[PDB]
Each structure stands twice: as C-alpha cells, then as structure tokens.
Design a protein around this nucleic acid. Structure first.
Lengths: 563, 141, 38, 131
RNA sequence: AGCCAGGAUGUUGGCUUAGAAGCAGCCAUCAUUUAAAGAAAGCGUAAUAGCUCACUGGUCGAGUCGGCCUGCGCGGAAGA
C-alpha cells in the first residue's frame, strides 16, 4: 500500500521483505508509475496492464495494453514468477524445460498450493487512497489464499492429546466445533462473543457445551457483523465467522462444541503487559463502580490485567504501552462513565538487620496490686543475609533462665511474628529476620502470653531500631533483548537509571541482555525502552532482590505514621 | 578473524567459565553462545587460574570456530596466589601492597612464559615482575 | 551563538578569527562555542 | 628533543655497534598490528638477542654526516621510519634472518633486506660454504 | 607548514574483588616489547569499531614557536 507517495518504490520493498523477514516474496504485480505517474498495475500471470479510472471511480478497470516503458522488466519478473511457480512440483518443471510456458490456471493452482504449504508470500501493489490496486488485490485474495477446506484439516483433540483425537473439518454434517476467539464489551446485553465455526452447524438458541470452561452454554442470538451493526441471522455454519450473544461462562480462546468433545484446541497463549499505573475515581465511594468496569475490561482483554494490590489499597492495572492504557482510561470514562485520575504505583520497601546480634531486654509486669499475671523475655537480634532462609522467618530457642510456661514458648515466637509483620521501621514486613531468646521470669501459675507478647513488642521495637536494620527498596531482575543498533543506548539509559547489569549473549536476531533495576524507577520504563530502539526490543521485568540506596524518598510512610 | 576485538572487558573470575552473570550487561552485541561457552577454558586453563584474578578472553577464530594463540596463567594471579597477600590497588599507601619477591618474579616468568613473551623470557620476567611489584609494594625476600 | 563580550578559546578546536572588525570564534567541534564580539 | 649535538652523538653511538659487529636493519612506518608488532619485536629480541633497538635517530643526512666518515653513501634513510636491529653474533646474524623473514612475510616492511656491509663486495649472499 | 605510519597477550588491572571495561567512579600501577603501552585524548569511555592524548622516523629545505614590557589602534558603546 501507499505506492502513490513520494520516494515510493516497489522492487525495493520486495527486496526488503526478501532480505529482512526471511521469506520469499514473488511479484504478482508490477507497478506502472512510482509517485504520481502511478496509473495502474501490470501483472505477471494475466500479462496485461490495468489502468484504473479517476478519483473514487476506480471501480472500473479499463484493461489496457502493457506500455513498452516497462515491457522488459515485466517480462523479467514474469519469467521469474514462472520458474518460481514451477518450483512447486515436478510435472510443472519438465513441461517448462521443454521450451513451453505454463498457463494461467496451472501457475495459479501451483502458487496457491505453495501458499497453502506456507512456502511463499505473494506481493500485490496499489494505493488505497488514490483508489488504485484494491480490486487487483482482491483478485489475489481469490486466486491464491486458501479456502477453509483448502487449509489442512483442523487439529482437534479429545480430553487427552494424540496425533488425531478429533479429526474435524468444515462440513454441514460435521459436529459443531468452533473457537471463541474474541469477546467484546456491550453495555446492552453484557458481552458479545465472536467465534469462528471450524466445523459443523449451530443455530440460534441451540445448546453448546463449553468444552474448556467445563459448562454448557447457549446462543441467545447469533449475529454476523457489518463492522458494528449486528446483523440478526438464524444459524452459522462451517467457515463462517459469527458473534454469539448472551453466552455467559465463555472467555477468549475457549472452545465451543457439541457433546462429542473436540474439547482441546491447541492455543492458550497471550503476552505479558509491560506498563503499569494506578487509578482513582472522582471519590473513593465509587470504588466498586470502578472495579466493576475494570472486571468487564479484564474479562474482555487478555493482556490487560486489573491488578488489585494488597500492600496498598490502590487498584493498579497493566497494559502493553502508554497508548493502550490511554484508550482503556478514556474507554473507561467513555463507555463506563467513571473518570479515573491516575498516578504511579507505590513502592515496596522492606526491613532487615545487617549481620550483628544485639542484646536487649524489655521489662514490665502487671499484678503489684492483685491484677492479672505478666510476661518478660530477653531477646538478641541476629539477622541472616538477604535470601538465607527461604521461609522469611527462622528461629532457634535458648530459654534457660526464668523458663516461660510450657505452653507459652511457641506463642513467644508467634508473638514476635506480629512484630515481624509490623516492621517497626516504617510498617514493612521484616524479611529473613531471626530472633534468639534467652531469659525471662515465670511461676507455676497462669501467666499471660499477651503480656509476654507486649513485653516482646517493646523488646522488638527497641532492639531492632538499635541493631540498625536496613531500609531496602525493590530491585527487579530485568531481561531485555534488542537489536545491535541501540544496545549501547538502552544500556546507557539503564545505567542513568540505576544500572546494575547481568550480561551479554548474541542471539540469532539480537542480543541477550539482563540487568537489575529498581521498581521505584521501572514504572514508565516501557515507552522509553521502545523509543530508544524503535520498538524492536523484547523484555520482561521480574524480581531478584531487595536492596538499599541513598534516597530521601525513604520517609513517606514514616511521615504518614510511625517514627 | 583476529585476536580479541570483542573487548567488552567483563566476566567472572576463572572460577566459573566466563560467567556472563558476573560479566554484567554493559556489553553490546558480541557473540558468546553455546558453541564456545565452555570450549577451551575448562579444558586447558586448569593450570592457569580457578577463582582468582583473571582478565577474560574475547577471542574468536577465522573458520566459525573459537581458537587463538593461548597463553599461560595471569601474572597478577600467580604472584598473588603464591604471595598470599591480596593487596595492590585500593590500599596502596599505608599498608603492604602485596608480596613481590625476586624468585617470585622468576617463578612468575616460569609460570606465565608459555606464549606470553616479551623481548625474551627474561623480558616477560620483567613483565610479571612489574606485575607483582607495581601493585604498590613488595616483600623482602 | 553566545554573544559574550569576553570570548576565549573555550575548548581545543575553538579558534579566533577577526571578521569585519569583530573578533569571532569559529569552533569546529561544538556549535555551542560560537561567540560573536571581541 | 632531536638535537644536532645529541644527534652527532647518537649517530656515532649507533655506527659503533656496526663498526664492531655486523649488519643491521630498519623498519618503515606503514602498518603494525598490536599483538603482531608487540610479540614480533619481542621475538626479534628472543631470537637475535637483547640487541634490538628500534631507534630512529639515523636521519637521512644526520647518519650521512656522523656515521659516514666511512661508507659515506649511508643516505639510505631516505626511506621511511627506522626500527634498527643489529647483531653481534656473526655476519648478518639471526637479526638479519628476522629482517629477511619480515621483509615479505606477515608484515609491511623490514627494510627490504638492505642490511649492511663492512666488505660490500659484488652483489651475492654468503652461502658458498658447504658443511 | 602540507604529504608515510606505529599506543598488550601481564592490565573485566594487582582492581571499592559483578570489572565498572586493553583508554567511566577508584586507586595508582613506563607494564622490557620504545618510528610506543598513558593502566590514556574525541568519539563505546558504563562496551568493543574506524578514525586515535602522546610521541616520533618519512616527507621537505629557510626560516621557525611561544611568551614579557610597550607606542598606536579595535569590541565593549543602546533614546526620544
């Protein structure tokens, strides 16, 4: 498309597709006139040149003779098409070797088989704006692309995988077996599920067993489309795309069929989002009216994940670019009339002591005037290195003096558990921490573990703060695969961020580069990454370690509450 | 086609074979893969270094292989694993900056004079002696 | 172009030329070092 | 500094090593690889001896004025840079062997086997000595 | 002045031990290899590339390069 524009060439585009993507493109067309001399298309099978009519009247064709300005190159790519088509099968090679050209019909069938077997890609030219080449492209659509049955038969599978558990094909007699491939949001009837009937016949209101989601569905209506207008039709048959209305349980990728089970269709794959932000409506009263629209959107779209957050009370969402979330936020404001003003996701700092154990106590008893009974325990604050105990909490007992009551020692660890989860630094769960306990006081009467737990509370909050834990910030393990044009540039951006880096390995089509970056910084990193390499980079962000960094952003929660 | 022109100077020590994991990713494009990830280092470097100072190779061959004129152990790792002392740079002013003896230099020649040469084996001896000594200081033996 | 009244050779490749009574600095490296009047 | 008095010194100081021993050489300035050049002058030392002095202080007229008190035609430094290499051990020693081997193999130029000569007889190498 | 060119394989430096890169922070560390290795100058200096701090022999044959004072000037210097 767009041959009509300045500097537009055809053979250069053909060479581009041949060289870069790795395929083999063959000209089914050659163009008469490059920029504004473009007046029509010459072919290599019909071998006649078509000159379309004037503006918006390109419906006509006016079959005309090939001009001599292009006869030689037309002949060259004609013979090249001829030999490339004869490359399909033997009986097309020798006939040509005998000094005789193949004819339109057999060249067309042979190339069409090449397209079926996915060996070749055919190129047609045109200018959809000057209304030239559209019909001649439809010509190729007809003459070379497989029909539903011309494709190899769909690989259906039973509840167990084999080579051919459910050999299905497009038939009016075959069982109704199709793939629900697209959901859509409709305010009126709730949802609107597209589906492409691979095999069989299904009717309005008829039954269908959701082979994957383990339920039976029904088709309240079956509507084929005019890009929006839902045409009401009775039934849909094999090879005929349609949109089902009202079926509740189904989502994208599911398989809908009769009770005869071509249950397993091969795919359940969709990419992972790369951008994430948080949202908030006009007021925190409408939060369910926001999460509702979010649920509809997350059931409509696979890559877009509504991500309720547990650390904070925000609702963050993940998409695959600044633009995708932008349509989502407006579509939310537009279709679901609740506007959400956005911000960054909160950080996930943490607490743990360096290496040193510090001896500390905390003393307070209760009953001096006849009251209930008390508790008291001595503790020493030993940490482990980040990532030592996979269980974030490890304990070793050393009680020998004032031995706390026999049913109270485990509750002492379980009460320092509360202090761990509390995280007296800024509220954050202390991780890999350990506490060792030595002393206390007791009688052979009913003392109160809660007093030992508060006692242990004072002990924890003093001894930790004075054993000087560390206030860590989330650091993510990053992987980025980008072409060798901007490796240095993307690495430069990363180092300007906080660059901790993993390594380098040359893939077939790029370079394997991993790194370590703070989650406090990776927020909008996706748009910048793609802008630094024209969007030819692949990457995922996942966690590796928590760690410290000199930063005066470390007091936000401390400001909201706590020391 | 030549000697190491993939000079992205970054790797683990000679303990784990040129581990990218400790190399770091500031290296742009060069082609380290499963063809020569563990090709010759773990085969003929067992007398060079295993987990000590090690400048890493960036060498590639001329016939779709990995080959070069290999050399002997690094001098700053031989005259430093035979000296005990791990000094050098960092504390080169008030402390002992590493043990460098004359027999240590002759032995560093004897250990890193396989193909690592200079104007002579004696010139490579002066080489490994500048190695052991210009870390900042020497031992008295 | 900077129009500072005290132009010097701010870099290596910034030279001093005297076009039309005025001393101009023509730098062959960084066009930030184009300063106008002596 | 490449001075006239210090050059009158260094020219005679480089001509004595050929007035007590045998032939020397030079090497121009056109092409030198890193590993090749380093290890190759290295091997020059390791094969001929520690008598490798790549010095270029034999200016095409300074040598013709300081060295040429005998063999006054020594203005053949009208060629490019000079990486000198004499040798004490015999006439046209392993240093001259390095010269002949580096003149055309794995190199740019090694003074094209210009060598030197105390006898400077008719043009013929010394190999009519079977053993 | 213009024309011919050469700066590691000890040295991700012994290195703030993942190097911060054969010439970032950082320490020093000609490290003989010299028409040369500074553990470096502009580009990759967080990476290699081809130009390359530096330096020089080649080329080519009468002047040449910076300062200090100083006579006289120039820009600074835009109104009803």
């Amino acid at each position: 498309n767009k041959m009509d524009r300045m500097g537009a060439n055809f053979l250069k585009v053909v060479n581009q597709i041949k060289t870069r993507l790795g395929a083999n493109p063959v000209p089914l067309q050659l163009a008469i006139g490059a920029e504004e001399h473009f007046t029509g298309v010459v072919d290599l099978v019909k071998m006649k040149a078509i000159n379309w009519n004037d503006a918006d009247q390109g419906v006509t064709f006016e079959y005309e003779d090939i001009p001599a300005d292009m006869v030689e190159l037309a002949n060259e790519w004609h013979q090249n098409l001829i030999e490339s088509a004869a490359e399909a099968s033997e009986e097309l090679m020798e006939k040509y070797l005998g000094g005789e050209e193949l004819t339109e019909a057999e060249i067309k069938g042979a190339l069409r088989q090449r397209v079926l077997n996915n060996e070749i890609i055919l190129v047609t030219c045109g200018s959809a704006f000057k209304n030239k080449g559209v019909q001649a492209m439809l010509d190729a659509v007809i003459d070379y692309l497989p029909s539903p049955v011309d494709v190899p038969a769909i690989n259906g599978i039973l509840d167990d995988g084999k080579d051919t558990p459910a050999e299905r094909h497009a038939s009016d007699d075959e069982p109704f077996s199709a793939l629900a491939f697209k959901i859509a949001t409709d305010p009126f009837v709730g949802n609107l599920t597209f589906f492409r009937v691979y095999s069989g016949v299904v009717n309005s209101g008829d039954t269908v067993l959701n082979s994957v989601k383990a339920a039976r569905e029904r088709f309240g209506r079956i509507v084929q489309m005019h890009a929006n207008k839902r045409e009401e039709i009775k039934e849909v048959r094999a090879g005929d795309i349609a949109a089902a209305i009202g079926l509740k349980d189904v989502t994208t990728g599911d398989t809908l069929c009769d009770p005869d089970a071509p249950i397993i269709l091969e795919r359940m794959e969709f990419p992972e989002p790369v951008i994430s932000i948080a949202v908030e409506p006009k007021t925190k009263a409408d939060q369910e009216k926001m999460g509702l629209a979010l649920g509809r959107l997350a059931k409509e779209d696979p890559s877009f994940r509504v991500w309720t957050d547990e650390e904070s009370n925000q609702t963050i969402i993940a998409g695959m670019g600044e633009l995708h979330l932008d349509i989502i936020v407006d579509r939310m404001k537009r279709e679901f009339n609740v506007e959400a003003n956005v911000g960054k996701p909160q950080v996930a700092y943490r607490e743990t002591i360096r290496q040193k154990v510090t001896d500390v106590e905390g003393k307070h008893a209760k009953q001096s005037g006849g009251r209930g009974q008390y508790g008291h325990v001595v503790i020493d604050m030993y940490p482990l290195e980040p990532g030592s105990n996979p269980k974030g909490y490890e304990f070793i007992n050393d009680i020998k003096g004032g031995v706390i009551p026999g049913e109270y020692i485990p509750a002492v660890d379980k009460g320092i558990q509360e202090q761990l989860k509390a995280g007296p630094l800024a509220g954050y769960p202390v991780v890999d921490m350990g506490i060792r306990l030595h002393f206390g006081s007791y009688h052979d009467v009913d003392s109160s573990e809660l007093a030992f737990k508060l006692a242990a509370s004072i002990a924890f909050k003093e001894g930790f703060k004075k054993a000087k834990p560390v206030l860590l910030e989330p650091i993510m393990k990053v992987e980025v695969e980008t072409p060798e044009e901007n490796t240095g540039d993307v690495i430069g951006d990363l180092s300007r961020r906080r660059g901790m880096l993993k390594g380098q390995e040359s893939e077939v089509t790029g370079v394997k580069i991993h790194a370590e970056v703070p989650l406090s910084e990776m927020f909008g990193y996706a748009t910048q990454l793609r802008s630094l390499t024209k969007g030819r980079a692949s990457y995922t962000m996942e966690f590796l370690k928590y760690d410290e960094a000199p930063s005066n952003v470390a007091q936000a929660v401390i400001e909201a509450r706590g020391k | 086609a030549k000697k190491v022109q993939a000079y992205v100077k970054l790797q683990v020590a000679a303990g784990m074979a040129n581990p990218s994991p400790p190399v770091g990713p500031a290296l742009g494009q060069q082609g380290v893969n499963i063809m020569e990830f563990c090709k010759a280092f773990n085969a003929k470097t067992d007398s060079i270094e295993k987990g000590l100072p090690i400048p890493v190779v960036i060498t590639v061959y001329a016939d779709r292989s990995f080959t070069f004129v290999t050399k002997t152990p690094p001098a700053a790792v031989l005259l430093k694993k035979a000296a005990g002392i791990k000094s050098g740079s960092g504390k080169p002013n008030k402390d002992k900056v590493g043990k460098i003896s004359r027999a240590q230099l002759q032995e560093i020649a004897q250990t890193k004079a396989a193909d690592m040469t200079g104007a002579d084996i004696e010139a490579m001896t002066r080489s490994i002696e500048g190695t052991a000594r210009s870390m900042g200081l020497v031992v008295e033996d | 172009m900077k129009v500072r009244a005290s132009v010097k050779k701010l870099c290596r490749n910034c030279k001093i030329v005297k076009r039309d009574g005025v001393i101009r600095v023509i730098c062959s490296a960084e066009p930030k070092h184009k300063q106008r009047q002596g | 500094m490449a001075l006239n008095l210090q050059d009158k010194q260094a020219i005679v100081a480089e001509v004595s090593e050929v007035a007590k021993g045998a032939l020397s050489a030079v090497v121009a300035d056109s092409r030198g690889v890193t590993v090749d050049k380093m290890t190759e002058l290295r091997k020059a030392g390791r094969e001929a001896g520690v008598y490798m002095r790549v010095v270029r202080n034999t200016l095409l007229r300074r040598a013709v004025e300081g060295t040429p008190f005998e063999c006054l035609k020594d203005a053949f430094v009208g060629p490019t840079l000079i990486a000198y290499s004499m040798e004490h051990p015999g006439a046209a020693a392993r240093l001259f062997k390095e010269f002949a081997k580096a003149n055309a193999k794995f190199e740019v130029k090694a003074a094209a086997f210009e060598g030197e000569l105390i006898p400077a007889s008719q043009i013929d190498r010394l190999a009519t000595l079977p053993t």
